[PDB]
Design a protein around this ligand. Structure first.
Ligand SMILES: [Zn+2]
Ligand SMILES: [Zn+2]
Ligand SMILES: [Zn+2]
Lengths: 117, 50, 1131, 100
DNA sequence: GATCAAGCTCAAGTACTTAAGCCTGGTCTATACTAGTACTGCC
């Protein structure tokens, strides 16, 4: 499914609101300021992920490997480059109760590989 | 404390004083014990009014 | 090259000694006042606007420079003379220096008639000077010069003298400014609130607080609003952005959300957009703001202008108040909304209000600067009104007569005298508690007071969160030193190596950042903010960067090289959020730490060598910091710092814990404060005990200062024979406790003897007391002056006489001299007269207003001093001396919270004794040890027995693995004693051995100012108050004890009604009134002429006597004053 | 109920109630003359408003919205209500519990 | 029989009262503008 992104007008750069062509019964994104219209391409106008199926690997960034306060381990090498050393940390993010899962990052420079056991 | 690492839930990091008074408390243990003492002092100085 | 573990214990303490030999103990106070005098005052003078006044001719009155001379005093003859602090303490003067400002008045009328007039060094006011500061006369003087000047070389300074009273400014805590803090209140209409107390870098002290909240989910979505200053109604963020000139919604999102690839962010910001879309122009948005503004929008034009200037001046002033900065304000408000969204989506943690990295300490510098700003504003106001009402008459005006120097002078004097921090009239907007009287009871008390902190949370608050010892107080504040009353956790004390930053200008840092690859905030495109790292300077978002790793490495190298970045500057690189917060603000509590590069310390052995020969090679702590071996780390950077407790942690272990340390502790005992550093083996006691000791060390007698014979203090306790503790911590050498000790090493025996020490009590040796054990002297100073307030009545010192004076008490006045002052060496008892003062009246023509001794004092006159006060009237100070021998009831306390009163005093013949003739000076009850867990007390007694038998000073440094109980026991077994300190004792009454071998040894005890002679009180029909005929309040007034409500309730439970009546009626305020039997109102009775009548009822026969308390009669009269008719119906 | 005690010197200091009654009598006399002689009634109005504020602040100073009756140093007066409001008052401070 | 008006009930918002006891010391106490009030040189 995936979320639904905002579409902006090309004249005033304002947000396009969803609307239907009553005669043709087709979804359009029309501007609430000027008279611009666009033919929708997703057909979905709203998506709310209540279960919050978020992959924290996307929130993690390679720069976290430069943190000296994080623990390092040699037992989990990096699969993308083979580097042995890697930092590991918890999610520590709200809305994630099962935060005891460990997320690893490769300490090698220019690799920044992220993964999870 | 800054002496520990992030996401450290070990007894020492979380304030488990493994030393006895006679043995002496390591500085971190001392600080955590001071925290607990603070808690007791506040409770004693607060309950009175109510 | 590397310091080996065996040499580390000496090297770290060498470094610590160099630190305290260079900085000192009150360095934060001295540096704050210095920075205030060099920078704050001059900046406030430049920051004041030139007052343009015109009838045509006009005048600008621009100030340009300041000059602060040394402290001086002008007598009535007017000759400027140098005033010493001792002279101020004696004459009750104010140790202040005059402030001379250069003024330029330009006259511009017409016809090219322009001319400048310069008034050099115009006396604008007096500023009180902090003792030992740069401008103090005691600056740079040697210890011998101070001794010649009758000053104590150990006196740290850091305090003012107002009317001869030593005042010390307590550092006030406040939430950091110019930083965004996203909190979440559980019970409120808002889920998350991102606030920002904004303030100009170095001006406009009022911190315009701006809130950006999110409406609670409970409506289509969650709306974002902003509580702007000077507006009493919340406003959606979109209107604010459009009012700033960003009308396109795409531009708004580009300023708020930096990553359009975050559909969660778009979905979270959508409700506010959909809620505020009808407005699409800047003028409409500004009109909306002006319509919501506190000021009424009489006209849309004014309304719009009102807003425009609010959004330009009040909203986020730290970002900029000039014009064309709407882009900067928009970016900052966007970042604020971004922070609110990150908190709402949970990707970021809420900010902790107790994190001291988020707090700032307002020291004397910023406090005096705030007062000076407000008072200089009031001065320019008075000068404006004066010049206006003179030019209105069409004539020139003299600025010398316009400048009311009394404003600044009396203002600073009043604030530092009373503590009400603010205008003299604004006694409610001002916060009290600042500028307390310096405690001079002992040197430790003085130091702690000069290193005291204050949290303005309010003692009435019952929330424990601000009182809790937060983790961030490590190394910055003493975990033990805190009051145990209603201010637990609120009043704190700095740690030994803690230094509060003074402040610095960020201009050089900004220039360095621009010189590197940073891009300014207006030059970049919002597309570049996604991956780039944000860079803040003092909370102002300046720009972005691409390689923050090497940027931080460079900034750190510069700070470690004392380059453009000074050591007090903080540099925290948040990695998860991709930001680099740089701080130069003042009040940032920080401490020094040893840099660790690989897993090895930069403090090599050559450094210890140079610090050992510190007196020859002039290699000091400053050179050690400049060598890049030490670094000042603040609480906010400790989050990003990985400390190594000791060099042992840097070694390779069987399992590597960190292996990536970046800093190291100089010594863990530095986490303790001043009154806690004196505790031996504090790591062997329960923390409450260490807190009680930190609170009593300030109450212990000793030698509060060397020139105590010169100081005429109101209350002073001096111990006859102070001794340095046999069991000493390595921090006392820096507290100078060895030079001004506050106790005596006592041969204490922990035993049950005659049960006269039970329930936390002690038995003293009468023979030791007879030999001067804990004997002390109490000095009390009485001050008085002759005021010539008016020709009707004048006061004068003169021996009163019965035939001329009227109000002469029955005490004899023969002890006085004809001058009216008693002479030294004279024996004086309670109610005796010491200053014979008479005031002329309008038994005739003069009333006695002499100064008597406080009741039940019984001292001897130590000395008498006579001088002239500021007004040139005669002023006398009489210091009376009373020798206090320790007796039953006096409080004594060890250094472990083991406090107690002397239960009884047994003679040396009656006290127990060892096989040798050693009786214990004190006997304490063993029951005081188990519950309190003061194992440090027993270890102190053991190390003390070993020190006394070995001829050395035991090292009781808190965290020292080189000294344990087994080593101490072995050393004690080497001198022919039981290894555990026990010893066979013999009953002093019978000589029989005691079945249980008692524990005995030297322990350092202290005598506390709480004697029984100063607390014993009694009353039997003494004086009473005036409003209600009830006993007075206090021993000084011979007052009675209060029979409170709880006592009334207890006697009710006992059912003793006669007793309750005696206590509440017959023993307090028995009274009689006459009431009318008809209306029950108090009638008019005249027992002399036996006539009783009620004017209301016109009757004079139906009157009745009623026995009621006077307070009851007064209550009924107070009700009749409120038109209530309480009718006492006796039938 | 309002004893005029002498301060540290000899000048007789008046009680807070005395000062408030003095203000009340000042505005009362002013209004009485302004009604005895035609004063346009505008001043009469304003006078009655000020008299009401004085009478109110005499028995109760903690008026919500209205300014607190001030005295020397800017301190609020101790109204009759504050004299027996709670702790340290007449009822709890001098009748239920008192010095003995 | 349907619609409108009046009355009753419920929910939300605003304002007012209380925050342990008793006990010991200390310090500090309105400017600010003003008119009159006397002095005192100046003539
Ligand atoms: Zn459009
Ligand atoms: Zn890798
Ligand atoms: Zn009657």
């Amino acid at each position: 499914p995936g979320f639904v992104g905002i579409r902006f007008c090309q004249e005033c750069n304002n947000m396009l609101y969803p609307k239907e062509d009553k005669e043709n019964r087709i979804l359009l994104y029309a501007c609430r300021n000027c008279d611009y219209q666009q033919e929708a391409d997703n057909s979905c106008i709203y998506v709310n992920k209540i279960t919050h199926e978020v992959d924290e690997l996307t929130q993690i960034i390679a720069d976290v490997s430069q943190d000296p306060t994080l623990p390092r381990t040699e037992d989990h090498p990096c699969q993308k480059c083979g580097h042995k050393e890697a930092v590991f940390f918890q999610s520590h993010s709200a809305r994630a109760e099962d935060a005891m899962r460990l997320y690893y990052v490769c300490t090698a420079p220019h690799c920044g590989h992220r993964w999870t056991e | 404390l800054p002496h520990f690492i992030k996401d450290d839930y070990g007894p020492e990091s979380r304030g488990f004083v493994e030393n006895s008074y006679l043995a002496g408390l390591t500085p971190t243990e001392f600080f955590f014990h001071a925290m607990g003492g603070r808690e007791g002092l506040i409770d004693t100085a607060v309950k009175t009014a109510e | 090259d590397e310091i080996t573990p065996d040499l580390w214990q000496e090297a770290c303490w060498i470094v610590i000694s160099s630190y305290f030999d260079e900085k000192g103990l009150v360095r934060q106070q001295l540096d704050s006042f210095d920075e205030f005098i060099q920078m704050s005052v001059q900046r406030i003078v430049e920051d004041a606007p030139p007052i343009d006044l015109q009838a045509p001719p006009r005048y600008l009155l621009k100030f340009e420079q300041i000059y602060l001379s040394k402290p001086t005093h002008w007598e009535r003859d007017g000759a400027p003379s140098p005033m010493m602090p001792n002279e101020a303490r004696l004459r009750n003067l104010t140790y202040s220096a005059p402030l001379y400002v250069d003024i330029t008045k330009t006259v511009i009328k017409e016809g090219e008639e322009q001319l400048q007039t310069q008034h050099q060094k115009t006396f604008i006011g007096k500023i009180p000077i902090m003792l030992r500061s740069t401008y103090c006369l005691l600056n740079g003087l040697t210890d011998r010069d101070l001794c010649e000047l009758n000053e104590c070389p150990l006196d740290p300074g850091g305090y003012f003298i107002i009317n001869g009273s030593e005042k010390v400014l307590i550092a006030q805590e406040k939430m950091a400014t110019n930083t965004v803090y996203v909190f979440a209140k559980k019970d409120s209409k808002y889920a998350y609130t991102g606030e920002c107390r904004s303030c100009l870098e170095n001006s406009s002290r009022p911190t315009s607080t701006i809130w950006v909240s999110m409406l609670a989910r409970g409506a289509i979505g969650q709306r974002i609003v902003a509580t702007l200053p000077y507006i009493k109604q919340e406003v959606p963020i979109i209107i604010v952005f459009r009012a700033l000139g960003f009308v396109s919604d795409r531009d708004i999102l580009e300023h708020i959300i930096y990553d359009f690839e975050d559909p969660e962010m778009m979905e979270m910001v959508k409700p506010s957009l959909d809620e505020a879309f009808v407005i699409q122009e800047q003028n409409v948005a500004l009109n909306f703001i002006g319509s919501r503004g506190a000021k009424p929008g009489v006209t849309k034009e004014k309304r719009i202008k009102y807003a425009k200037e609010v959004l330009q001046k009040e909203m986020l002033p730290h970002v900029g108040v000039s014009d064309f900065c709407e882009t900067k304000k928009a970016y900052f408000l966007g970042y604020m909304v971004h922070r609110l969204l990150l908190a709402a989506l949970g990707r970021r943690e809420l900010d902790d209000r107790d994190h001291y990295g988020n707090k700032r300490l307002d020291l004397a510098g910023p406090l005096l600067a705030f007062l000076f700003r407000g008072m200089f504003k009031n001065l320019l106001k008075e000068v404006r009104i004066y010049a206006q009402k003179f030019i209105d008459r069409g004539k020139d005006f003299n600025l010398e007569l316009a400048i009311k120097t009394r404003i600044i002078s009396d203002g600073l004097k009043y604030s530092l005298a009373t503590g009400n921090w603010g205008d003299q009239k604004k006694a409610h907007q001002a916060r009290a508690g600042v500028s307390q009287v310096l405690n001079r009871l002992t040197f430790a008390s003085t130091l702690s007071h000069l290193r005291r902190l204050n949290s303005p949370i309010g003692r009435d608050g019952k929330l424990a969160k601000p009182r809790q010892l937060h983790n961030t107080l490590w190394g910055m504040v003493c975990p033990a030193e805190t009051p145990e009353g209603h201010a637990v956790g609120l009043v704190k004390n700095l740690a030994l190596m803690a230094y509060i930053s003074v402040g610095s200008q960020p201009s050089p840092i900004l220039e360095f950042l621009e010189e590197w690859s940073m891009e300014n905030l207006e030059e970049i495109s919002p597309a570049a903010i996604a991956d780039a790292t944000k860079i803040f300077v003092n909370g102002c978002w300046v720009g972005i960067h691409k390689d923050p790793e090497q940027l931080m490495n460079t900034l750190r190298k510069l700070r470690r090289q004392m380059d453009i970045i000074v050591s007090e500057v903080s540099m925290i690189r948040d990695i998860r959020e991709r930001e680099i917060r740089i701080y130069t603000d003042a009040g940032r509590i920080c401490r020094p730490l040893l840099i660790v590069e690989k897993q090895k310390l930069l403090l090599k052995k050559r450094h210890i060598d140079q610090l050992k020969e510190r007196e020859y090679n002039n290699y000091s702590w400053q050179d050690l910091v400049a060598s890049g071996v030490v670094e000042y780390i603040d609480t906010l950077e400790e989050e990003t710092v990985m400390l190594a407790m000791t060099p042992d942690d840097l070694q390779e272990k069987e399992v590597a814990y960190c292996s990536t340390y970046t800093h190291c502790e100089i010594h863990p005992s530095m986490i303790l404060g001043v009154c806690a550093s004196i505790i031996p083996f504090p790591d062997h006691n329960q923390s409450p005990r260490n807190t009680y000791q930190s609170a009593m060390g300030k109450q212990a007698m000793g030698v509060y200062i060397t020139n105590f014979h010169v100081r005429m203090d109101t209350l002073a306790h001096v111990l006859y024979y102070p001794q340095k503790p046999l069991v000493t911590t390595r921090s006392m050498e820096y507290l100078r406790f060895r030079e001004l000790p506050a106790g005596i090493n006592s041969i204490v025996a922990i035993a049950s003897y005659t049960g006269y020490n039970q329930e936390d009590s002690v038995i003293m040796n009468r023979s030791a007391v007879d030999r001067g054990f804990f004997r002390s002297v109490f000095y009390r100073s009485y001050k008085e002056q002759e005021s010539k307030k008016g020709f009707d009545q004048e006061e004068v010192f003169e021996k009163p006489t019965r035939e001329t004076c009227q109000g002469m008490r029955h005490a004899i006045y023969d002890k006085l001299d004809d001058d009216g002052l008693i002479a030294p060496g004279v024996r004086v008892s309670g109610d005796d007269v010491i200053i014979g003062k008479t005031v002329t009246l309008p038994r005739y023509t003069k009333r006695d207003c002499s100064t008597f001794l406080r009741t039940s004092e019984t001292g001897i006159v130590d000395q008498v001093m006579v001088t002239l006060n500021q007004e040139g009237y005669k002023f006398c100070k009489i210091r009376v001396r009373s020798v206090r021998i320790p007796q039953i009831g006096d409080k004594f306390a060890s250094r472990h919270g083991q406090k107690g009163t002397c239960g009884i005093q047994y003679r040396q013949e009656d006290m127990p004794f060892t096989c040798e003739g050693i009786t214990p000076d004190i006997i304490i009850n063993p029951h005081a040890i188990p519950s309190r867990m003061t194992i440090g007390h027993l270890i102190e007694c053991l190390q003390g027995k070993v020190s006394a038998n070995k001829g050395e000073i035991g090292d009781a440094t808190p965290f020292n693995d080189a000294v344990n109980v087994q080593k101490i026991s072995n050393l004690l077994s080497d001198y022919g004693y039981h290894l555990r300190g026990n010893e066979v004792l013999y009953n002093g009454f019978t000589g029989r051995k005691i079945t249980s071998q008692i524990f005995i040894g030297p322990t350092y005890y202290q005598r506390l100012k709480h004697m029984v002679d100063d607390k014993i009180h009694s009353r039997a029909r003494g004086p009473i108050q005036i409003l209600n005929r009830q006993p007075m309040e206090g021993r000084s007034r011979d007052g009675g004890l209060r029979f409170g409500e709880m006592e009334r309730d207890c006697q009710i439970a006992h059912g003793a009604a006669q007793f309750l009546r005696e206590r509440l009626f017959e023993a307090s305020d028995p009274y009689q009134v006459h009431v009318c039997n008809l209306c029950g109102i108090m009638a008019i009775a005249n027992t002399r002429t036996h006539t009783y009548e009620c004017r209301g009822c016109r009757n004079k026969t139906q009157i009745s006597l009623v026995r009621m308390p006077y307070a009851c009669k007064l209550l009924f009269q107070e009700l009749m004053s409120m038109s209530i008719a309480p009718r006492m119906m006796s039938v | 109920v309002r004893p005029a005690v002498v301060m540290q010197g000899s000048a007789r200091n008046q009680d807070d109630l005395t000062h408030k009654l003095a203000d009340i009598v000042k505005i009362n006399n002013q209004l009485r003359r302004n009604e005895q002689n035609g004063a346009a009634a505008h001043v009469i109005a304003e006078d009655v408003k000020l008299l009401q504020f004085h009478v109110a602040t005499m028995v109760d100073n903690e008026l919500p919205g209205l300014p607190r009756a001030m005295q020397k140093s800017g301190r609020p007066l101790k109204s009759l209500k504050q004299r027996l409001k709670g702790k340290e008052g007449r009822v709890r401070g001098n009748l239920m519990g008192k010095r003995v």
